Design a protein around this ligand. Structure first.
Ligand SMILES: *O[C@@]1(*)[C@](*)(O*)C(*)(*)(O*)[O@](*)(*)[C]([C])[C@@]1(*)O*
Ligand SMILES: [Ca+2]
Ligand SMILES: [Ca+2]
Ligand SMILES: [Ca+2]
Ligand SMILES: [Cl-]
Ligand SMILES: [Cl-]
Ligand SMILES: [Mg+2]
Ligand SMILES: [Mg+2]
Ligand SMILES: [Mg+2]
Length: 506
């Protein structure tokens, strides 16, 4: 006996939230799904991924951009394709700064680069374009610095020594560059960054350098967090127990099929465990800190553009990436690298646009809301209109279906209203109240009776579960979701889709 939206006159309290919930930045990021990376700097000009070998070459020799950087085309293309954030390499491992920095002469101001307006600040140009399009921003500032003399332990003569005799403290240099960028309103979206990216990667032979994450965290939040009057702390990647955005554990855009947005942290020992299983961090059902699972990936073969690494991935590769990241409760952070002309190759921009168009066309028509279709449930929390099944098809992440206290599992019946072709089932857990679902099942059949065919079963839902199959014909789809004893499931949205040709399962 299936329950619809009609004649619900009951009362219920909201389900208790989980102990561990996303902050407002983490929740917005998980619902944005798509972010863009922008790697740009001397490596763009030198056919290399790690700029380890510049030595004493001048900024003007290694950063040779001769045209005004085209931030407007990049940002417009990304915004039109559905990307909601741009994370910029202000400084890569080479140490070259693409903003005008008073703390170093190893920067774009020293390179001789000037835009149409006589300014020398690529990070400011990108920030202006992002601000104009209301594109949120992240700041990538490499902890490892191959150039900066304060990096490592060196005496007043520049020769290796012990930490007590180190003449210049890299932790102060890095902190000062954080303050210089984050404290200046010409950087960010209207002065604001929502994510700081601290790469953990470092050369095997590089100098030892202990990082003062506590110091840097304070500078970040005093500029971009609750202490600065924002509604959440600025998200941090690569900051030990301060981490609020975790690395998915590979650079291929792949999240584990059952991914939890939670890690185990030790604030005293400054550690984080995100449960590495095979090639991905799958998190913990009982994790004590929300971490957004962030799958960083390259649209080309490298992070930097180059003449031998400018062919963009195919739609087959990018569709697989989408379903294995966004469809597995992870964000996709896709790099789109500018070229040595300060533009983006037309082939790369066209593939970004094609990828965005395919995602939009795939999710345009929710077959759970087509003519004659209906969404019903096995039970409605308190028989209350506040938890009605139509809350799963209202395109409002704040409204959800849930069951009554004592009912840890429920079923959703989607009647498509006729025999219907589909290949994607979409399920979104109301993660503002926690990630708690630990079993799901999706089944389908012809007609309105008889046995069910299994589409998919697994553990997690989280921000988004996409179940992608081969083209299937059905009249009805049944979704089962369950949590542990003493909790109830909360589903904010569901959908059924037929993907575009270039998003179909191979
Ligand atoms: O290069 C590379 C590095 O190493 C890492 O850390 O990250 C990524 C993104 C890139 O940048
Ligand atoms: Ca030093
Ligand atoms: Ca700021
Ligand atoms: Ca809803
Ligand atoms: Cl290389
Ligand atoms: Cl209840
Ligand atoms: Mg949404
Ligand atoms: Mg420009
Ligand atoms: Mg300077």
């Amino acid at each position: 006996n299936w329950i619809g939206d009609e004649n619900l006159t009951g009362n219920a309290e909201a389900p208790a939230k989980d102990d561990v919930v996303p902050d407002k930045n983490q929740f917005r990021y998980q619902k944005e799904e798509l972010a863009a990376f922008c790697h740009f700097g001397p490596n763009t000009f030198n056919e290399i991924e790690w700029g380890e070998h510049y030595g004493n070459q001048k900024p003007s020799e290694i950063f040779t951009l001769k045209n005004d950087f085209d931030a407007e085309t990049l940002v417009k293309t990304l915004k039109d394709a559905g990307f909601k954030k741009l994370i910029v390499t202000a400084k890569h491992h080479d140490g070259f700064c693409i903003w005008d920095s008073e703390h170093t002469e190893y920067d774009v101001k020293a390179s001789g680069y000037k835009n149409k307006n006589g300014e020398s600040d690529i990070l400011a140009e990108i920030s202006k374009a992002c601000t104009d399009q209301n594109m949120d921003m992240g700041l990538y500032l490499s902890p490892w610095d191959i150039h900066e003399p304060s990096y490592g332990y060196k005496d007043e003569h520049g020769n290796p020594t012990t930490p007590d005799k180190d003449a210049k403290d890299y932790n102060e240099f890095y902190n000062n560059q954080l303050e210089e960028i984050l404290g200046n309103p010409k950087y960010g979206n209207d002065g604001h960054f929502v994510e700081v990216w601290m790469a953990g990667a470092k050369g095997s032979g590089a100098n030892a350098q202990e990082y003062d994450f506590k110091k840097w965290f304070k500078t970040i939040q005093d500029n971009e967090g609750k202490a600065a009057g924002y509604d959440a702390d600025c998200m941090l990647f690569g900051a030990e127990a301060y981490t609020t955005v975790r690395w998915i554990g590979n650079e291929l855009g792949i999240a584990g099929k059952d991914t939890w947005s939670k890690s185990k942290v030790d604030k005293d020992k400054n550690t984080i465990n995100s449960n590495k299983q095979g090639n991905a961090t799958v998190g913990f059902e009982d994790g004590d800190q929300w971490t957004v699972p962030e799958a960083d990936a390259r649209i080309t073969s490298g992070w930097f553009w180059g003449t031998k690494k400018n062919t963009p991935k195919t739609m087959e590769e990018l569709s697989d990436m989408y379903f294995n990241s966004v469809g597995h409760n992870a964000t996709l952070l896709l790099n789109v690298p500018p070229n040595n002309q300060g533009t983006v190759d037309k082939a790369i921009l066209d593939r970004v646009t094609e990828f965005g168009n395919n995602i939009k066309a795939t999710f345009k028509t929710n077959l759970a809301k087509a003519e004659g279709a209906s969404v019903k449930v096995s039970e409605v929390r308190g028989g209350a209109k506040e938890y009605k099944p139509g809350n799963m098809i209202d395109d409002n992440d704040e409204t959800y279906w849930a069951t009554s206290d004592g009912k840890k599992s429920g079923e959703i019946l989607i009647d498509l209203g006729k025999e219907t072709k589909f290949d994607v089932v979409s399920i979104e857990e109301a993660i503002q109240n926690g990630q708690r679902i630990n079993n799901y099942k999706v089944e389908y059949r012809n007609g309105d009776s008889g046995t069910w065919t299994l589409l998919e079963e697994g553990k997690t839902i989280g921000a988004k579960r996409l179940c992608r199959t081969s083209e299937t014909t059905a009249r009805q789809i049944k979704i089962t979701v369950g949590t542990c004893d003493g909790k109830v499931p909360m589903i904010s949205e569901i959908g059924v889709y037929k993907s575009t040709e270039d998003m179909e399962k191979p």
